[PDB]
Amino acid sequence: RHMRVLFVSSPGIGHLFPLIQLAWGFRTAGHDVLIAVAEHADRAAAAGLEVVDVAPDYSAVKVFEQVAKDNPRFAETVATRPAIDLEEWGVQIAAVNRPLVDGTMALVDDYRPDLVVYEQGATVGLLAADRAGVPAVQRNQSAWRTRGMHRSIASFLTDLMDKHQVSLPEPVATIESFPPSLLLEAEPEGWFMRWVPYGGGAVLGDRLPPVPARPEVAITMGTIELQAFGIGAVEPIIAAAGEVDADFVLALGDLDISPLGTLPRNVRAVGWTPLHTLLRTCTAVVHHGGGGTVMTAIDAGIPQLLAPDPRDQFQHTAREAVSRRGIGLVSTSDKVDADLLRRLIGDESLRTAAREVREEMVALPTPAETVRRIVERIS
Ligand SMILES: COC(=O)NC1=C2/C(=C\CSSSC)[C@](O)(C#C/C=C\C#C[C@@H]2O[C@@H]2O[C@H](C)[C@@H](NO)[C@H](O)[C@H]2O)CC1=O
Ligand SMILES: Cc1cn([C@H]2C[C@H](O)[C@@H](COP(=O)(O)OP(=O)(O)O)O2)c(=O)[nH]c1=O
Ligand SMILES: [Cl-]
């Protein structure tokens, strides 16, 4: 009954955080839990868990650069359109997974997991499960449909699969990220699960901060877009914000915001803060379209505007749904203006719809319940 469970994540905070509730779900159910990730191992440790860094010195941004340089045709074609069918993006996602393989396979041999839980980007997790000979459970991201994505990714890792004597298995269960209404007409892949936001711990101070008298709007762009494309995209958003009669809080995480210089007087900045803690006191949020941020805004019950850098192809899958369900607005960073921010804060139908989608979401099975379901499925 007592298991060793290995959680496997691609080297991204947006990849890793959606595994944390399940990892604490397994730990509080008495199991041993270990995380495999690269680049962000210290953040995983700051969730109170044990971590092995399966690729020391990894840099996602350097991997991205190497892909573009090495695949100029892909870069000038497929990469000029949104990443929707990830089968087409196998070359890029395989480049991301490749450096994690050797370290993950060694870890599987040493740790001997009974179960692998991996996030949807981490084909290396399926390979790990096959190495150990154990079931794999997939945790989905945003609204991407899996289809043949793992076969396409694996087609570029063939050499490594041969060396480690592994084939690509199918997961025994898949767990959706979004609530049913935000998948539109796309067929669900497995179980729905409530989104319980995780963004790190925090000392809030000597008291619980009160909700401000004036409405505050958060501006956040996740953990990879501005790192990969530069901080420039947030400038037109901040300029538009300075023209709006509302207060704004800029939350770009560990990103150095020095290049922005002096912010408008109605815009304040914070360093890394768990997003749900920030949003507890906000009226709306402007962001890039990251799935974790979309879901955390829904947990807060607030309208959202998705305005990524126009070059970023990985923020597309929530956009149609945010639109069609009326819980927010969609644009691009360079097209944000004061009128659009006023719509975000003023259109009551957006807030009504957000609250309705939140009600749907918070009734879904919890991570604790989902741990029980997984254990039943594999027993
Ligand atoms: C801006 O630059 C990018 O976005 N980069 C990339 C991301 C990748 C794959 C995603 S699709 S597989 S999950 C079916 C990538 O494989 C690799 C990597 C390492 C870090 C990263 C991020 C990228 O996605 C991020 O994933 C989050 C889970 C999403 N929220 O749910 C975010 O919306 C999205 O921003 C390749 C990549 O280039
Ligand atoms: C920048 C920032 C992000 N976050 C969280 C919100 C999300 O859970 C996660 C970002 O994931 P996500 O929004 O999926 O996008 P990306 O992969 O593009 O970064 O990081 C914080 O909690 N605090 C912060 O200061
Ligand atoms: Cl959070």
Residue type, 344: L
Query: What is d(CA 135, CA 116) in angstroms, rounded to the nearest whole number?
Result: 6
Query: What is d(CA 128, CA 160) in angstroms, rounded to the nearest whole number?
Result: 12
Counting ligands in written order, which one lies closest to the CA of residue 14?
2
Pocket of ligand 2 (CB under 6 A): 12-14, 17, 199, 220, 222-225, 251-253, 272-275, 290-293, 296
CA 253: distance to chain centroid? 14
CA 283: distance to chain centroid? 22
- How many angstroms does the Cα of residue 226 sit away from the middle of ligand 1? 13
Indicate where the chain has its CATH 3.40.50.2000 domain(s): 1-204+363-379, 205-362
- How many angstroms does the Cα of residue 221 sit away from the middle of ligand 2? 7
Residue type, 356: E
Is the C-beta atom of 92 inside 6 A of ligand 1?
yes
The atom number, within ligand 1, closest to the CA of 223 reads 35
Partner residues linked to 249 by β-bridges? 218, 268
| Method in brief | X-ray
Fold category of 205-362 in CATH: Rossmann fold (3.40.50)
Fold category of 1-204+363-379 in CATH: Rossmann fold (3.40.50)
With the CA atoms of 147, 150, 156 and 161 taken in that order, what torsion angle do they form, in degrees rounded to the nearest 10?
A: -150
**Mind spelling out the 3-state secondary structure of the chain?**
CCCEEEEECCCCHHHHHHHHHHHHHHHHCCCEEEEEECCCHHHHHCCCCCEEECCCCCCHHHHHHHHHHHCHHHHHCHHHCCCCCHHHHHHHHHHHHHHHHHHHHHHHHHHCCCEEEEECCCHHHHHHHHHHCCCEEEECCCCCCCCCHHHHHHCCCHHHHHHCCCCCCCCCEEECCCCHHHHCCCCCCCECCCCCCCCCCCCCCCCCCCCCCCCEEEECCCCCHHHHHCHHHHHHHHHHHCCCCCEEEEECCCCCCHHHCCCCCCEEEECCCCHHHHHCCCCEEEECCCHHHHHHHHHHCCCEEECCCCCCCCCCCCHHHHHHHCCEEECCHHHCCHHHHHHHHHCHHHHHHHHHHHHHHCCCCCHHHHHHHHHHHHC
Query: What is d(CA 76, CA 362) in angstroms, rounded to the nearest whole number?
Result: 42
